[PDB]
From Swiss-Prot, chain A:
Transmembrane segments: none
Superkingdom, taxonomy of origin: Bacteria
Alphabetized UniProt keyword annotations: Antibiotic resistance, Repressor, Ribonucleoprotein, Ribosomal protein, Ribosome biogenesis, RNA-binding, rRNA-binding, Transcription, Transcription antitermination, Transcription regulation, Transcription termination, Translation regulation
Molecular function in Gene Ontology: mRNA 5'-UTR binding; mRNA regulatory element binding translation repressor activity; rRNA binding; structural constituent of ribosome
GO cellular component: cytoplasm; cytosol; cytosolic small ribosomal subunit; small ribosomal subunit
Role according to the record: One of two assembly initiator proteins for the 30S subunit, it binds directly to 16S rRNA where it nucleates assembly of the body of the 30S subunit.
Name assigned to this protein: Small ribosomal subunit protein uS4
Organism of provenance: Escherichia coli (strain K12)
SMART domains: Ribosomal_S4 (SM01390), S4 (SM00363)
Family of this protein: Belongs to the universal ribosomal protein uS4 family.
Annotated GO biological process: cytoplasmic translation; DNA-templated transcription termination; maintenance of translational fidelity; negative regulation of translational initiation; response to antibiotic; ribosomal small subunit assembly; ribosomal small subunit biogenesis; transcription antitermination
HAMAP family for the chain: Ribosomal_uS4_B
Swiss-Prot record, chain D:
Outcome following mutation: residue 27 to A: No change in kcat for peptidyl-transferase by RF2
Protein name, as recorded: Alternative ribosome-rescue factor A
More info: Active protein is only produced when SsrA(tmRNA)-SmpB-mediated trans translation is limited. ArfA can be synthesized from truncated mRNA, via ribonuclease 3 and the SsrA tagging system. In the presence of SsrA, the stalled ribosome is rescued and the incomplete nascent ArfA is tagged for degradation. In the absence of SsrA, truncated ArfA chains are released from the ribosome and are functional.
Effect upon mutating residue 17 to C: No change in ribosome rescue activity
Disordered, as annotated region: 29-45
Family to which the UniProt record says this protein belongs: Belongs to the alternative ribosome-rescue factor A family.
Species of the source: Escherichia coli (strain K12)
Bias kind Basic residues: ranges: 32-45
UniProt effect for mutating residue 33 to A: No change in kcat for peptidyl-transferase by RF2
Keyword field contains Cytoplasm: no
BP term (GO), one: rescue of stalled ribosome
Portion of the full-length sequence here: 2 to 46 of 72
Keywords, ordered alphabetically: RNA-binding, rRNA-binding, Translation regulation, tRNA-binding
Subunit composition and interactions: Interacts with the 50S ribosomal subunit. Interacts with RF2/PrfB on the ribosome. Contacts ribosomal protein S12 (rpsL).
Swiss-Prot record, chain E:
Disulfide bonds, paired cysteine numbers: none
One Pfam family of this chain: Ribosom_S12_S23
UniProt miscellaneous comment: At least 19 substitutions or deletions in 11 codons can promote streptomycin resistance, dependence or pseudodependence; all but one of the streptomycin resistant mutations (K42R) are associated with hyperaccurate translation and thus reduced translational efficiency.
Any GO molecular function: rRNA binding
Entries under Gene3D superfamilies matching the protein: Nucleic acid-binding proteins
Modification 3-methylthioaspartic acid, positions: 88
Effect on the protein of changing residue 42 to R: Confers streptomycin resistance but not hyperaccurate translation
Species annotation: Escherichia coli (strain K12)
Protein name in UniProt: Small ribosomal subunit protein uS12
Protein keywords: Acetylation, Antibiotic resistance, Methylation, Ribonucleoprotein, Ribosomal protein, RNA-binding, rRNA-binding, tRNA-binding
UniProt-listed GO biological process terms: cytoplasmic translation; Group I intron splicing; maintenance of translational fidelity; positive regulation of RNA splicing; response to antibiotic; RNA folding; translation
UniProtKB/Swiss-Prot annotation, chain G:
Mutagenesis / variant outcome for changing residue 103 to S: In strain: NEA-319; neamycin resistant
Family: Belongs to the universal ribosomal protein uS5 family.
Protein's UniProt name: Small ribosomal subunit protein uS5
UniProt GO MF annotations: rRNA binding; structural constituent of ribosome
Subunit and partners: Part of the 30S ribosomal subunit. Contacts proteins uS4 and uS8. With proteins uS4 and uS5 encircles the mRNA as it enters the ribosome, which may play a role in mRNA helicase processivity. Can be cross-linked to mRNA. In collided ribosomes contacts ribosome rescue factor SmrB.
One matching Pfam family: Ribosomal_S5_C
Keywords: Acetylation, Antibiotic resistance, Ribonucleoprotein, Ribosomal protein, RNA-binding, rRNA-binding
Organism listed in the record: Escherichia coli (strain K12)
Physiological role: With uS4 and uS12 plays an important role in translational accuracy. Many suppressors of streptomycin-dependent mutants of protein uS12 are found in this protein, some but not all of which decrease translational accuracy (ram, ribosomal ambiguity mutations).
RNA sequence: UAGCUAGUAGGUGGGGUAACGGCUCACCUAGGCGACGAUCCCUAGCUGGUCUGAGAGGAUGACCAGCCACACUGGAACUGA
RNA sequence: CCCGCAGAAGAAGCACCGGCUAACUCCGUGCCAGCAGCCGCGGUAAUACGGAGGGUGCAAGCGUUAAUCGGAAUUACUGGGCGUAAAGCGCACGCAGGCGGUUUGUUAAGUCAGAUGUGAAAUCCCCGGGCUCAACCUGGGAACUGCAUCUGAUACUGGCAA
């Protein structure tokens, strides 16, 4: 299912740091970003009006690490939900379990938190869960099992998140390594630059 | 002969029974007069294990409906003091 | 009250029986216009107390032939 | 492999029947520019 | 128009016929394939296009195109027929599935080898 | 051949609004006065008068706002070849509420928004947008 | 803040004595992103000299549109010469989902979440005159309460 | 595919069925159905549903459930509630 | 289902890359071999053939074929047309049908409002619950646009009387 190819190549197709490799080091410039996604990278695309919608859908997939048939089941659920569809869509993606583990601080990247969920190392609301697509309801707690606690990787990734934004919709202790998912996030918080305007329109044609 | 028997709906290895009033000469999932509750044998330590509309079961026994031995045992589970 | 239908006689001459057109005013399903449709019925009476071309009153009953399961109630507005 | 030619049951000549057959019709090409060179959309774009 | 005129004769739905009479909606048909040959196309193209007639297993006698470079069919060679016209040969409305029951895959494909019936090379 | 008198009322209004006519005179009827009382009370028509003794001849003084026709458009909906009867919840709304739809109900002729409040429908008549 | 945008470029001919002389016709639509549109056609011998000739026409041909803060007021039709455009306010119908050359003028209009459909012809030059006909033919409850009802609280509800 | 129909359409009476009834038989009346499509021909199990579509509709009716039908082919009855 | 063991260890393909439609160059071949859904490519500098490097798409799947609806307002009730594009009978009279000026009365058939009976369950939709999650299973509700009945309302339509 998972991509698991070169993942800093997926940033250069957007020209956007999708936080895929980034991890332990600081500001990279270690791929010739904005310049060359392949052999014919130095050429500028015309990028027609279908291309500006597809490259915005692929960006939101390549951030959260979601394949298409699963991302199309989020949209089909986000349309039937009450309210705004592009705000139901990002709430479902941000409420994934491997996202919440990433947002609490556990895991330098998101794929690390996907493995940290998958290998029975994450205890949400007193139970161990394999599935990274677990949909974390508000007022749930989520923590680390002591079989995998302070195992030299969650320690480094937790201090690394001190230089990050520290999201509003969740509290985390990070000494007991048990964070409480407080509420579902609002669109005014989450990153403001992904243009969910276009993703709703692409599945309509 | 009408009878108040279970139905065996549900998934595989996850049975869910519909205690139901039907003619005897039909299938287990076949034609029934009215559903009169449900029975979940594997439910949880939770809120609901079994509902059972006894005002209709007393109505059908008053018409002369037989009761299969699971459903009669579930009336012995939904007792006047239990 | 018994259920009963107005009507109008098509033909008399079949010996203690009479055929009646009942006009029903039904809407078309797709197009929404009301279509004047007709329900012909064989109707029982006694011998010749109603004639051809006049309003009639009909009720449903037990079968009396291969058709003719309806019965006369009364005769309003006889044939002029 | 075989060739389904036009002239059914060719008698005499075994090579001057096929010369009229559309296997050996005259291939004439298109100009550009040249008396008959209008594009309207070319090979690309 | 005129909703009264739509009551007499309803607005009759246009019937579209099938492009491939391959006996009533089946994906492939097996064929006995007499008379393998080549034919020149219609006007603008001028190639030598390989095409076989096919005795289908129901009674139909259709001609059918053989895609790809080089084939091993000979005068019976029972093969499998899929639909799809070629637009360039007159009367050809079918293709042959390369890689099915007699019609071997194309020699040395490397790209697009599901079509043209070539297994993935081991080396 | 004078089949719908009511659509003849409406086409005299559009041709009045288009030609910038001051007022529009037509043969009067019982149903004409009911519809014109709606359009007077709703704001599409100023001051209808029904002056007529044995040949009743009503006139509708038309309304113009800027130099501009107040009636945008007015379509005879339930024309006599196709009668259109609507239920309470099935009652339409023109221009998403800000036009009106004259409906003939069991409590007389009124607008759509009054027939929701009464809670009863009937034959809608026109869509005064 | 002016948000100029391109729709279609076409190559047209004149066919004179020697050969035929080609020229290029742009089609641009500008708009502030809040209730104002404008289009200009523009044509020249060379493609970039046509588009900036089309942008300067679009600035001086602007129409005012009164919109419900992200969307249309009411379902309006827009006929112009081939194009039977319907476009519906879609009260947070979530996204400008309109057809080609109709999506272009509406995304720079200032509306974000309407429905639409073009019927009939689909010529980009005509359908962009067709929707700008519809956005001018749309009127607000601030305006229809100046003719009928004479009360914005009684006209709408 | 323009007229089909002789137990055919109705009546009276006997018989028959668990039960009304041309269901059946004798006798009498000559009707009955039909352009709102009888008759004949082609195709087809029917419904809840399913797929699609913004809707109205269009296509379809596998699994699941309701009804009918048939059990090598044609026909007949016996037993039995 | 839980615990323990070892070892990054046993586990990534298929289509596409001229336009539509996201994604490009080199080599080979020269209207040949071939491609192709449409328009069309190939005649010696082919982003369209074939291979290579690169890229895009989907991913334990990926394509082709077939069938269905959609786009198609391209049978248009919703929702089309008919001077010249497809299309006004050559022109009339006229039965059946369709439609019908104006006022009062009555009728309440059509219509509208309410009630009751029914419209099997599952299904679909809403709010929840149970499998680590989802699919799935399930509780409650809404729906099932209908048909019948009764009670009214009387504007409009129909009947009937003037």
């Amino acid at each position: 299912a998972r991509y698991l190819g070169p993942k800093l190549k997926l940033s250069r197709r957007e020209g956007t740091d999708l936080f895929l490799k980034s991890g332990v080091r600081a500001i990279d410039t270690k791929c010739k970003i904005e310049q060359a996604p392949g052999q014919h990278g130095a050429r500028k695309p015309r990028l027609s009006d279908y291309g500006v919608q597809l490259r915005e859908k692929q960006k939101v997939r390549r951030i959260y690490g979601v394949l298409e048939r699963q991302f199309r089941n989020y949209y089909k659920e986000a349309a039937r939900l009450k309210g705004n569809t592009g705000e139901n869509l990002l709430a479902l993606l941000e409420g994934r379990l491997d996202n919440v583990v990433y947002r609490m601080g556990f895991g330098a990247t998101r794929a690390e938190a996907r493995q940290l969920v998958s290998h029975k190392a994450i205890m949400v609301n007193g139970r161990v869960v394999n599935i990274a697509s677990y949909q974390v309801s508000p007022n749930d707690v989520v923590s680390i099992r002591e079989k995998a606690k302070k195992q030299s990787r969650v320690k480094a990734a937790l201090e690394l998140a001190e230089q990050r934004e520290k999201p509003t919709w969740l509290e985390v202790d990070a000494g007991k390594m048990e964070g409480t998912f407080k509420r579902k996030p609002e669109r005014s918080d989450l990153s403001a630059d992904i243009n969910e305007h276009l993703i709703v329109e692409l599945y309509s044609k | 002969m009408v009878t108040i028997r279970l139905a065996r709906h549900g998934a595989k290895k996850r049975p869910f029974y519909q205690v139901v009033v039907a003619d005897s000469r039909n299938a287990r999932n076949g034609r029934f007069i009215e559903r009169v509750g449900f029975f979940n044998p594997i439910a949880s330590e939770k809120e609901e294990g079994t509902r059972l509309d006894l005002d209709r079961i007393a109505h059908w026994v008053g018409q002369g409906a037989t009761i299969s031995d699971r459903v009669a045992a579930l009336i012995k589970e939904v007792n006047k003091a239990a | 009250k018994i259920r009963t239908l107005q009507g109008r006689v098509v033909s008399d001459k079949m010996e203690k029986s009479i055929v009646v057109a009942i006009e029903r005013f039904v809407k078309h399903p797709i197009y929404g216009k009301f279509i004047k449709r007709t329900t012909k019925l064989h109707v029982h009476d006694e011998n010749n107390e109603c004639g051809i071309g006049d309003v009639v009153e009909i009720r449903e009953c037990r079968p009396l032939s291969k058709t003719k399961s309806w019965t006369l109630v009364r005769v309003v507005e006889k044939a002029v | 492999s075989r060739y389904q030619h036009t002239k059914g049951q060719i008698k005499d000549n075994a090579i001057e029947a096929l010369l009229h057959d559309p296997l050996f019709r005259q291939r004439v090409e298109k100009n550009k520019k040249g008396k008959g060179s209008y594009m309207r959309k070319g090979k690309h774009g | 128009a005129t909703v009264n005129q739509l009551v007499r004769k309803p607005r009759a739905r246009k019937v579209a016929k099938s492009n491939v009479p391959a006996l009533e909606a089946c994906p492939q048909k097996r064929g006995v394939c007499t008379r393998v040959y080549t034919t020149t196309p219609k006007k603008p193209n001028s190639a030598l296009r390989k095409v076989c007639r096919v005795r289908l297993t129901n009674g139909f006698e259709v001609t059918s195109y053989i895609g790809g470079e080089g084939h091993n069919l000979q005068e019976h060679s029972v093969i499998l027929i899929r639909g799809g016209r070629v637009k360039d040969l007159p009367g050809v409305r079918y293709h042959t599935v390369r890689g099915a029951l007699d019609c071997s895959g194309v020699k040395d494909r490397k790209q697009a080898r599901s079509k043209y019936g070539v297994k993935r090379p081991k080396a | 051949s004078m089949q719908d008198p009511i659509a003849d009322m409406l086409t005299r209004i559009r041709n009045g609004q288009a030609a910038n006519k001051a007022a529009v005179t037509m043969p009067s009827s019982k149903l004409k006065v009911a519809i014109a009382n709606v359009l007077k009370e709703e704001g599409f028509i100023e001051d209808f008068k029904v002056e007529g003794d044995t040949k009743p001849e009503l006139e509708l003084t038309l309304k113009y706002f800027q130099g501009k026709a107040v009636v945008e458009s007015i379509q005879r909906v339930s024309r006599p070849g196709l009668r259109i009867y609507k239920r309470k919840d099935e009652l339409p709304k023109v221009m998403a509420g800000l036009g009106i739809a004259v409906v003939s109900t069991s409590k007389g002729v009124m607008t759509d928004r009054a027939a929701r409040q009464a809670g009863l429908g009937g034959e809608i008549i026109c869509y005064v947008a | 803040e002016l948000q100029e945008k391109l729709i279609a470029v076409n190559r047209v001919s004149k066919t004179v004595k020697g050969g035929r002389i080609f020229s290029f016709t742009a089609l641009t639509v500008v708009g502030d992103g809040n209730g104002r549109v404008g289009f200009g056609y523009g044509k020249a011998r060379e493609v970039p000299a046509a588009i900036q000739k089309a942008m300067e026409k679009a600035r001086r041909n602007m129409i005012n549109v009164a919109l419900n803060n992200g969307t249309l007021q009411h379902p309006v039709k827009g006929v112009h010469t081939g194009s039977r455009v319907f476009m519906q306010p879609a009260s947070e119908g979530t996204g400008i989902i309109a057809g080609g050359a109709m999506r272009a003028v509406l995304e720079v209009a200032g509306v974000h979440n309407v429905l639409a459909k073009a019927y009939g012809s689909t010529n980009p030059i005509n359908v962009v005159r067709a929707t700008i006909d519809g956005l001018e033919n749309m009127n607000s409850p601030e305006m229809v309460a100046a003719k009928r009802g004479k009360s914005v609280e009684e006209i709408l509800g």
